[PDB]
């Protein structure tokens, strides 16, 4: 009789951007009061609906996607903005109806040396369309002669590691985005 905003906000392992974990929250009382009224976040930016008046609208299907991106790529998670995270990772559709909640978390996700587990796709031969998780790791060929199976000259493995340190600037730190797409 209350929607799971505990299984998706207070969690231990926010996924990596390439495999953004999406949960279907449905048939329950959602209280978007706790979320907006918490100052832990740092980019509530709600495109479509209005952050303030949000507890009343009966959203038909709430799909909380959740990932970890660079500390400066919070922009690429905004309807329209395009680049590495948008085109070759997670794309917020041109007409996104919902909010892009996000904390720049260092303590939890940054290791002195590098938590190399939060990953990100770079070289990708397909700008991902709205809400797509290209979990594949195909050795990307770019120059000419197909490598196929081997990494080397003019052949780069896509999924590159972020590697986050507790020293890195507030734009290179790990950022945990939880875009709350509504109907």
């Amino acid at each position, epitope marked *: 009789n209350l929607c799971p905003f505990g299984e998706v906000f207070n969690a231990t392992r926010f996924a990596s951007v390439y495999a953004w974990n999406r949960k279907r929250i449905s048939n329950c009382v959602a209280d978007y009061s706790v979320l907006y009224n918490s100052a832990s976040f740092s980019t509530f930016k709600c495109y479509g609906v209005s952050p303030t008046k949000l507890n009343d609208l009966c959203f038909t299907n709430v799909y909380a996607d959740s990932f970890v991106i660079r500390g400066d790529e919070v922009r690429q998670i905004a309807p329209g903005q395009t680049g590495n995270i948008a085109d070759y990772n997670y794309k917020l559709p041109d007409d996104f109806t919902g909010c892009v909640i996000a904390w720049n978390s*260092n303590n939890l996700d940054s290791k002195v*040396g590098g938590n190399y587990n939060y990953l990100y796709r770079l070289f990708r031969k397909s700008n991902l369309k709205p809400f797509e998780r290209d979990i594949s790791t195909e050795i990307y060929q770019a120059g000419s002669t197909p490598c196929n199976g081997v990494k080397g000259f003019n052949c780069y493995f896509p999924l590159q590691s972020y590697g986050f340190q507790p020293t890195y600037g507030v734009g290179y730190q790990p950022y945990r985005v939880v875009v709350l797409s509504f109907e």
Partner: antibody, heavy 118, light 107 residues
């Protein structure tokens, strides 16, 4: 050896402020966190919140929000805890437990500070 | 807040047998459920972590299995000197929550 010595069997009046020690050695102290669990005699372990061993931020568990604080004096390989304003319902052991940032499974090793109170 | 109930409370066993102790999480802990043991007057010890994989350096008489909200480790060869207050743990949602414990006893 990778073992976490702990402070001796404490005992204090209901209202003192005391500080158990978890001095580490053997691993890179910075690498993992420093969870702190407690266990009342007739009950079970309860996590109480860690401290990022490069900053010292005490992100306590949602229950032990108040009088407990974790004081990290790094470069000495120490991760002290400091219960404050002790009550008569805290007559429990308080363990150290190296549980990292990416793992969060403890290997709960703390010899156990027998914090009796009366 | 994850209400982790492990059952049965106190289940006796006899030497050399095979005993199963189960653990049920109120919400989903999907595959983060570690397993500890604690002989009295001791700091517990990890036994199974992520509910399937085994810790290196454990006497591998027991290993665990499960997923979702149903988890267990079954002692494939018990020996008397255990009587260990076994503990669940999850690692999915803060706060990490343990289980009260399935104390073992010989007849």
């Amino acid at each position: 050896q990778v073992q976490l010595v702990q402070s001796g069997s404490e005992l204090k009046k209901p209202g003192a402020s005391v500080k158990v020690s978890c001095k580490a050695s053997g691993y890179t102290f910075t690498d993992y966190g420093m969870n702190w669990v407690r266990q009342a005699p007739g009950q079970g372990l309860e996590w109480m919140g860690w401290i990022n061993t490069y900053s010292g931020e005490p992100t306590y568990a949602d229950d032990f929000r108040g009088r407990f604080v974790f004081s990290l004096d790094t470069s000495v390989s120490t991760a002290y805890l400091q219960i404050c304003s002790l009550k008569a319902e805290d007559t429990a052991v308080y363990y150290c437990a190296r549980g990292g940032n990416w793992d969060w499974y403890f290997d709960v090793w703390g010899q156990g500070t027998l914090v009796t109170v009366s | 807040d994850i209400q982790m109930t492990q059952s049965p409370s106190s289940l006796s066993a006899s030497v050399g047998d095979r005993v199963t102790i189960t653990c049920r999480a109120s919400q989903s802990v999907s595959n983060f459920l570690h397993w500890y043991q604690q002989k009295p007057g001791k700091a517990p010890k990890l036994l199974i972590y992520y509910a399937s994989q085994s810790i290196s350096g454990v006497p591998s008489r027991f290993s665990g299995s499960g997923s979702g909200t149903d988890f267990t480790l079954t002692i494939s060869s018990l020996q008397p000197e255990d009587f260990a207050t076994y503990y669940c743990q999850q690692s999915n949602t803060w706060p990490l929550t343990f289980g009260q414990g399935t104390k073992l006893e010989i007849k």
